[PDB]
Amino acid sequence: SSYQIAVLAGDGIGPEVMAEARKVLKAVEARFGLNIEYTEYDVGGIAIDNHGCPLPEATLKGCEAADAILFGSVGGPKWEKLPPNEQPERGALLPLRGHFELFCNLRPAKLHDGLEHMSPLRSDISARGFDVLCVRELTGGIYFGKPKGRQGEGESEEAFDTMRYSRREISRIARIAFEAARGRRKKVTSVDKANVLACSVLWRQVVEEVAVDFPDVELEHIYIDNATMQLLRRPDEFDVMLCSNLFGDILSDEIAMLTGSMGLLSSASMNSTGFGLFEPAGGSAPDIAGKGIANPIAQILSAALMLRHSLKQEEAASAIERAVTKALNSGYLTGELLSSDQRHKAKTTVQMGDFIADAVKAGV
Amino acid sequence: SSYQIAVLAGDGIGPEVMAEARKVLKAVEARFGLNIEYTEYDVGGIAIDNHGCPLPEATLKGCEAADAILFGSVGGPKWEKLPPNEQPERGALLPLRGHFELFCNLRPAKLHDGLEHMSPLRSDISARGFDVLCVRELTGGIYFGKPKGRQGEGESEEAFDTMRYSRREISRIARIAFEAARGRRKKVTSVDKANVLACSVLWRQVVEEVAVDFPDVELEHIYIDNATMQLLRRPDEFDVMLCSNLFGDILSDEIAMLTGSMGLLSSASMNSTGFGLFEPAGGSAPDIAGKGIANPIAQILSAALMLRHSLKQEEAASAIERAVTKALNSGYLTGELLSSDQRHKAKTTVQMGDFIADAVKAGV
Numbered sequence A, B: 001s002s003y004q005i006a007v008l009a010g011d012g013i014g015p016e017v018m019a020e021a022r023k024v025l026k027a028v029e030a031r032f033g034l035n036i037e038y039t040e041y042d043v044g045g046i047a048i049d050n051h052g053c054p055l056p057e058a059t060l061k062g063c064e065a066a067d068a069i070l071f072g073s074v075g076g077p078k079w080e081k082l083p084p085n086e087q088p089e090r091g092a093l094l095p096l097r098g099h100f101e102l103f104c105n106l107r108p109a110k111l112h113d114g115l116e117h118m119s120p121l122r123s124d125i126s127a128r129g130f131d132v133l134c135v136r137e138l139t140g141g142i143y144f145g146k147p148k149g150r151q152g153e154g155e156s157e158e159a160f161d162t163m164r165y166s167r168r169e170i171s172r173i174a175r176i177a178f179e180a181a182r183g184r185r186k187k188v189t190s191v192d193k194a195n196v197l198a199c200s201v202l203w204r205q206v207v208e209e210v211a212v213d214f215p216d217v218e219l220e221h222i223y224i225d226n227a228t229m230q231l232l233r234r235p236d237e238f239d240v241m242l243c244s245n246l247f248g249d250i251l252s253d254e255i256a257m258l259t260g261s262m263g264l265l266s267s268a269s270m271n272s273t274g275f276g277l278f279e280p281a282g283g284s285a286p287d288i289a290g291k292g293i294a295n296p297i298a299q300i301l302s303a304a305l306m307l308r309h310s311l312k313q314e315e316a317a318s319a320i321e322r323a324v325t326k327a328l329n330s331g332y333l334t335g336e337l338l339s340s341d342q343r344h345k346a347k348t349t350v351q352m353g354d355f356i357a358d359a360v361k362a363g364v
């Protein structure tokens, strides 16, 4: 029967890249006989303008009635002057994650063949390639721990945040990491600060407990500060990186930037029932919105991740992935992926979407 | 009159690089007529072997009687199998910082002329150069906040750490940052997670309060995740980076690795009275210890920082710095700073020390 998708395109380039993801999805629906219905809701900046808050109740209820959320990007100059805590990115994302218990974040990043030169790494390092899957715990740690707040006044006014983790929270995300590694290159690198943080001592201990179920997977532990360095020297040696909430926030951005190709990167945030929120890794790029320049690949790959993980449609997910590969090796590239002597070869957002949808229809 | 220095050389390469720092310091003492007495104490790994703990009481008392601590490096394979919390690096460093209230950490990093190629950045980025001073708050935040620990058992066993900051703690480190920027390129970039953390909301607020005393210095705020990316794209645009304890731990390592030349980098940790602990940025490199290969420049520059900040001997500090510059542009380089087709030109640890001490004696 029918699937129901909540479409939260957001701000900036969100709507124009979402339109291309819908176009590709239509080709998929036809080719594989899937019956999917979409409802669009305001979120982020547009929601503050139209409803007074970044996550309206009608949008939240709409997501509750869906099988998955296909999310664009939120934020922009306009709302930045608001205080960072009432403000559209955090205002949409933290309650969505908390409400639906989206504990698992997957952020795959790889260097694509032929695009190694866009990486900001030295050429001999980027020529080696890399392919790293960051698994980030999304609902625990210091993001949602209590108590959180402030007290006192004047010089002695103090603020406090509490990082908290339970064995139960650690083992459920660790298992995901190990199961992923088993399908990839069978290595998990767990990232912590166990020489300082009590949470990190528990983290390391629990990850080693979970490891006994996965004797085929190699486990190593690395301190977060050292990890930021090692990713610059030997990114080819990591497979799955397992991180707590805040450490994963930090490392996943570092790794994204190391690709030099953020327009290609997608993210999945899921709960244990398979419901998730699927989004491009980059921001809303408000300075390029409405010009047909934006790269829709990240939003298209988000749809592929949604098909795989929430809708259990592996063949449909794979077909999109292959259509993206065909675009990239047939010279269908957007402007930000070309040296600016090549810039006149750039394809527009719509040309990209047309090409990819056509490839799927053609049986790629 | 006389100055008293506690010498804590530690493990691995610590003693062999410390010997070269002492050699340079002797040339300085003679040239500028300084009267300095040194006492050596065990710390770290060697202290666990000889005394049963990484920071013996006799060493702590010795540091209390000194004007500054000239520190080497601690740690190694041998002690790693101990639990990360009883373990020599953390076991020496956290109590030293806490005991002497060493709230201010300075970690200068720059790309030296002629060594841009050792950076792991793409050549066009590293050709631009950079020079960034990281100012890290060292005694507050999540390192020493309470409560810290665990409770419960089984699946519901939980650990917790508390990040806490007061206005007083934030304003004292911010002022240092602004005063440094005023002597450099008059820009402070404050790094926080103000869209999630209550401490970061207070941080940003207090830094803006302090800013009113420095209308000649430009202030910007950036989120920690975004900062890890921007350092890969435009490191030349940062001057002073101002960070809380954990964010500074992370960013300072990223920046160090971006130089490709960690043997050149030193660190100062100081309290408000001028007492400090001065150390090389890198580790104890136990695999090269005792071979005459290690680069003593970081330990020599630590001594220069000690002369400047704790002993208020600016001319003596500067003379060392210039002697290091003369070595680097006269081809006095250690092995890790040469491409391995050049490796036969490498100077040993002692040759480096002799050259630098000789330069100081010659009036550089």
Ligand SMILES: CC(C)[C@H](C(=O)O)[C@@H](O)C(=O)O
Pocket: A089, A090, A093, A094, A249, B195, B196, B225
């Ligand atoms: C907007 C912010 C709350 C969010 C986070 O910190 O998780 C973002 O940085 C991210 O990586 O998704």
Ligand SMILES: CC(C)[C@H](C(=O)O)[C@@H](O)C(=O)O
Pocket: A195, A196, A225, B089, B090, B093, B094, B249
């Ligand atoms: C050894 C560890 C406690 C220490 C820290 O986290 O401050 C180290 O990583 C550093 O940067 O000096």
Ligand SMILES: [Mg+2]
Pocket: A249, A250, A253, B225
């Ligand atoms: Mg982030």
Ligand SMILES: [Mg+2]
Pocket: A225, B249, B250, B253
């Ligand atoms: Mg560190």
